[PDB]
Write a protein that binds this DNA or RNA. Sequence first.
DNA 1: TGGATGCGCTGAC
DNA 2: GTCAGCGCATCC
Length: 327
Amino acid sequence: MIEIKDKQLTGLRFIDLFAGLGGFRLALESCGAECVYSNEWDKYAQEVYEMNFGEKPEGDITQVNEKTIPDHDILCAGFPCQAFSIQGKQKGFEDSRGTLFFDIARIVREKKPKVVFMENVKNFASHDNGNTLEVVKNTMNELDYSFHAKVLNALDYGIPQKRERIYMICFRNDLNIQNFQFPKPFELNTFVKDLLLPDSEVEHLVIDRKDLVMTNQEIEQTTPKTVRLGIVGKGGSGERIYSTRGIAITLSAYGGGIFAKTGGYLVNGKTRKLHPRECARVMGYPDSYKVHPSTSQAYKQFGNSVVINVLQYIAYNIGSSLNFKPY
DNA sequence: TGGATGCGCTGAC
DNA sequence: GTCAGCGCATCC
Ligand SMILES: Nc1ncnc2c1ncn2[C@@H]1O[C@H](CSCC[C@H](N)C(=O)O)[C@@H](O)[C@H]1O
């Protein structure tokens, strides 16, 4: 993540729905916001959350009375995506996990915050012939909010990862916010290579598979793009190797394959998957962030998480707007 | 709501 | 035909 000298969100309270690792909290708190509530039902996620912010998130959002939720200015919710993901079976709102946005909606209807900051995968924007994005949109509008949604690739904001996600920013209409803009992209100057830990700390992650079929030659110059170099097995998910001279591929939560959840990489003549700390770094997390003691759980958490930096800029712009109160 | 991993197949070139 | 995906299925 980056530092924010002008705390645009000072004075604003927010809530961390579907908390996870607390990505939205890190991003918003870096702008001065104060977290007044967090909700997450996963045990292990609650542990690492607690481990980094003290409090333990409340459970099942569907069993919480919106009226219980403390008052706030911004609602942060990066709801589930398996049901909207391109690799999932896209059952959408017909997935027991695809209806969480309606819980978010019933919390907004009641707590009427100034802003609703949401995040879900890229395929969410075009899922079910863009009918899904529209529901989320028309729902928000019906709730008397403006709907600003765009798909942003982390690689365009300083993080070497091709993580495309839809960010939906909503302002309560009485605020008449008319100048919100998504961060403008910039040149990437960091790649997988710059975030790796010393070889001495990742030998265990080394994978020597007799069925490695190096499909391409390693690249000399860095690039703001994923560069596949080889394959293991049938080269499905978790069976692809990339150049550390490029950017990393999207981290996943339930990912399989031998290079499960992070993908494989060619590092100093050897092939291995990323280490939890490297997953943190590739997600914009500061090295001060305490990752979960269970590496499997930690991989699942970073795969489900968000790229802080991207959230930071969007957050800076949300406040930058809220603050424009000319006479 | 455990950990590991082989795989299907849809989406946007 | 290419290739990447906050995933899914099945095993211990
Ligand atoms: N009914 C429910 N109640 C509370 N949390 C839920 C939930 N259903 C799913 N979740 C949580 O929703 C999260 C979605 S992934 C979001 C992660 C978050 N942005 C962070 O930065 O990492 C998961 O951690 C999942 O356990």
